[PDB]
Design a protein around this ligand. Sequence first.
Ligand code: ZZ3
Ligand code: MG
Length: 208
Amino acid sequence: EVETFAFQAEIAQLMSLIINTFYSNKEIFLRELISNSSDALDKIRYESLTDPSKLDSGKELHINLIPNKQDRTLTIVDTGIGMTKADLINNLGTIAKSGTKAFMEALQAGADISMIGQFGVGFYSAYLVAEKVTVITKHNDDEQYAWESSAGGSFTVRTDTGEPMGRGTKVILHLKEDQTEYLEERRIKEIVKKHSQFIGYPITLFVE
Ligand SMILES: CSc1nc(C)nc(N)n1
Ligand SMILES: [Mg+2]
């Protein structure tokens, strides 16, 4: 039922660097995730422009932010295009090998971790705040899958039989014990307003 894969070496190295480097401006992970969701919502809107049935699995294009203090999770949900099993395994549909290469040269040459999103690997900035990340995804062309990784060089993929989602991606951040400020409503609102003010889809911050 559960398959375990090794990260490619460059992605393991990116993740160690993210986890191990001293770097205080951790809040940017949320901008990077919301941006990835905005990109996914753009793709499904674009397909729907020529085939409206692409939206049978859900017409509303939005992002929800759901903090849960009991489980210590921040979940970002979008109703974007979702990912196939193949996309999930291939670095969550990114060109993570070459983006990691360019990001790491950029760093050597004075860049900082906040510019990670310019290299196509902003997903992995989740590991600034999360000890484990769970991604549940559903693409129109495939079943619902759950990817998961606490870093250390491996990730799992299984068919997900949790709550169906229709279409899109849900990123569940199991936060590090010292990063629970990102479950506080005013902290989340501050970061969305600071870094995500011009995203073109409604962003709903759920209350507890
Ligand atoms: C990199 S794939 C991805 N990542 C996130 C955070 N959201 C979506 N929709 N896709
Ligand atoms: Mg590549």
